[PDB]
Design a protein around this ligand. Structure first.
Ligand SMILES: [Mn+2]
Ligand SMILES: [Mn+2]
Ligand SMILES: [Mn+2]
Length: 391
């Protein structure tokens, strides 16, 4: 193998400007990093800059360097959707025609009608809400009626809340499995059905650790599957395992924050493995992009950047670091959805003694999967063109 270990970091939602097909999505003008940089009066990301972020695109506080540490370019999404699952599935070598849906005005009556028809239970709520908001509003009604609180977030999810002392956990799980079947329908296609059991009393409801997720498997066998099948390590950090529903994963490390994600990345650098370590930094999307909070987003990017020099120090000659994103989520954009954007790609190994160069623009995110597959000599994905030889 050219590289013994590849460290792949997805800065979730960290887009680098509207894609050629942004108009289709109502995403004209979208620019995640650029708008944040403007809000911050210049972003402080000296390490990403050293890698060549400004060489991809110059933005406020983010300038090009003469000798970037590694190779750089951006990637264009080929799949139809701009959601997390589509982006990640494409990165690992797939092409996804059918987009996952979001529901800012709640779910269509037709879906909720069938769920009622199959479960024998009434549905209340049917809107985007945090767990706390929806429970304060409807928790008491739920307890008194045995109805199901159905709600969503800004992402492609269908969440079902029920009090553990009113709806048995096992019954809630059965209901979520029914909802999971009904939502395998392109009209209602949600990435994830989530059981949200809760306990307590009016004015004091708490969601329990008995949350269960019902995800769809990737629409194809991914480069991760092939790595696992060839006895390579595939270490998933953060939301990665969930995003792929465990497919191709050999070890999964849960994280609770971006900083914790970087700590686990550091943990994997200290591990003797051969294969892939794959981190998702989710705070960018979950805490800042969807909440349209450019200040919080900017601070998070600066916090992430400050962690990088330790990563640089731990990389070996036969390690490769890949940093990218899965879509945009411009925190100064209308609405709460993601934005259709190019994503940055930075590829760095300490063995690049003379620094890196510009790569041709990646015409699909699957170019990452193809590169990983070629490196480890496993079956090449159907989509994607490897840039391994360019490095
Ligand atoms: Mn938009
Ligand atoms: Mn995402
Ligand atoms: Mn999102």
């Amino acid at each position: 193998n050219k590289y013994k270990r590849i460290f792949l970091v997805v800065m979730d939602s960290v887009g680098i400007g509207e894609a050629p097909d942004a108009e289709q999505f109502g995403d004209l003008g979208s620019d995640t990093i650029g708008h944040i940089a403007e809000h911050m009066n210049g972003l402080q990301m000296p390490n990403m800059v050293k890698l060549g972020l400004g060489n991809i695109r110059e933005m406020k506080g983010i300038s090009k360097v003469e000798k970037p540490l590694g190779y750089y370019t951006k990637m264009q999404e080929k799949s139809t959707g701009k959601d997390t699952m589509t982006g990640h599935w494409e990165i690992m070598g797939l092409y996804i025609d059918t987009p996952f849906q979001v529901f800012p005005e709640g779910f269509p009556k037709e879906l909720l009608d069938e769920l009622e028809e199959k479960t024998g239970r009434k549905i209340i709520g049917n809107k985007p809400a945090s767990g706390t908001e929806i429970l304060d509003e409807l928790g008491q009604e739920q307890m008194e009626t045995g109805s199901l609180i159905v709600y969503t977030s800004a992402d492609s999810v269908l969440q079902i809340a029920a009090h553990e002392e009113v709806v048995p956990l096992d019954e809630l799980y059965k209901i979520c499995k029914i909802a999971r079947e009904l939502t395998l329908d392109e009209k209602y296609m949600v990435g994830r059905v989530i059981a949200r059991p809760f306990v307590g009393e009016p004015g004091n409801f708490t969601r329990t650790p008995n949350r269960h997720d019902y995800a769809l498997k990737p629409f194809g066998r991914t480069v991760m599957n092939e790595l696992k099948d060839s006895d390579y390590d595939v270490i998933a950090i953060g939301k990665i395992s969930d995003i792929y529903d465990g497919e191709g994963v050999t070890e999964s490390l849960r994280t609770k924050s971006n900083m914790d994600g970087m700590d686990k990345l550091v943990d994997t650098l200290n591990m003797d493995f051969t294969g892939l370590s794959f981190l998702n930094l989710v705070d960018f999307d979950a805490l800042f992009g969807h909440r349209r909070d450019p200040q919080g987003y900017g601070e998070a990017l600066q916090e992430y950047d400050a962690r990088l020099p330790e990563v640089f120090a731990k990389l070996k000659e036969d390690d490769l670091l890949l940093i990218t994103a899965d879509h945009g989520n411009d925190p100064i954009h209308p609405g709460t959805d993601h934005t259709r954007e190019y994503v940055p790609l930075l590829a760095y190994s300490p063995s690049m003694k003379e620094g890196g160069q510009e790569l041709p623009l990646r015409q699909t995110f699957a170019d990452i999967g193809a590169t990983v597959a070629e490196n480890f000599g496993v079956k090449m994905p159907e989509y994607g063109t490897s840039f391994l030889n360019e490095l």
